Hints:
Layout: E1 3-8, E2 21-26, H1 32-42, E3 51-57, E4 63-66, H2 72-82, E5 88-94, H3 101-105, H4 109-126, H5 133-147, H6 159-169, H7 177-181, H8 185-197, H9 204-215, E6 224-230, E7 236-243, E8 247-250, E9 259-262, E10 267-274, E11 282-288, E12 295-299, H10 302-319
Antiparallel strand pairs: 1-2, 3-4, 3-5, 6-7, 6-12, 7-8, 8-9, 10-11, 11-12
Helix pairs in contact: 4-9, 5-8, 5-9
Amino acid sequence: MERVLKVFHYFENSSEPTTWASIIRHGDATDVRGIIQKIVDCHKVKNVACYGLRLSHLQSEEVHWLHLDMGVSNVREKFELAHPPEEWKYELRIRYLPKGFLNQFTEDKPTLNFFYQQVKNDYMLEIADQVDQEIALKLGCLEIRRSYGEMRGNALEKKSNYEVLEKDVGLRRFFPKSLLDSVKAKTLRKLIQQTFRQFANLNREESILKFFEILSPVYRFDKECFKCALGSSWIISVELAIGPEEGISYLTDKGANPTHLADFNQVQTIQYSNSEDKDRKGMLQLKIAGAPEPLTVTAPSLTIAENMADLIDGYCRLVNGATQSFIIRP
Length: 330
């Protein structure tokens, strides 16, 4: 008949951030696009094409982005052979960013907030413990500012208000533990009071935008990179960068900008297979309007190639007005 699927997401709700999720039924005709659409529609999203679905095994670090055309029941059955349902996590995420994405999301608050929460969640989890103290302070203060959006500008100068954050809410919701564990409760207070002061005047949008401005120099959230190789006979190792500003590009130096290969609007088709020989690499091949030869990518695994295929295809849908896939199947 049908089955129920928990899908975590970053649409804010008056509860624990970990517990932001939607429980949706799915039949045996339902596809991934269906799920996404269903969920984003509830929250009045305008930029529907920006969103994708990422499957994670809770034990291992492996990550699989589910393709929009794929059936839910088909894909769920495949992964449930490997490991039981409780070990998988399905979470909705923004993966396919438009050019000027921040400025655009400004006209779509649910999405701007979703992106903010997704990225802030990734920050806290990956690098907050090893970013500068000044940065970890600022980014936390900005969340206070946004989160307590009605609060006065000097309200944290009043001990008792800071105390609510210390004791009732917990400073763990805003700052990394490394920051909290060094510095004394009384010196941290004076640092937070003082840091918050420079963002006291900001509204919720200004807060969210300032967050990104401060985060982007020290943490990448505007593209994905893959170490793989280009060429169909002479293979060359590179680190591809795929994102809005650069389209498909490759990295060279630390500090130097990506070198451009091709924009998404030129990509005509996408196909991927596992290494076309005796190996376990993943081949990914693109037909591109303008170039004579197609762009043959060799990734370290089929999983990475599958994931690269989703990324590019997702962007192709976005950049054109498309709902058809640009991935050639059988």
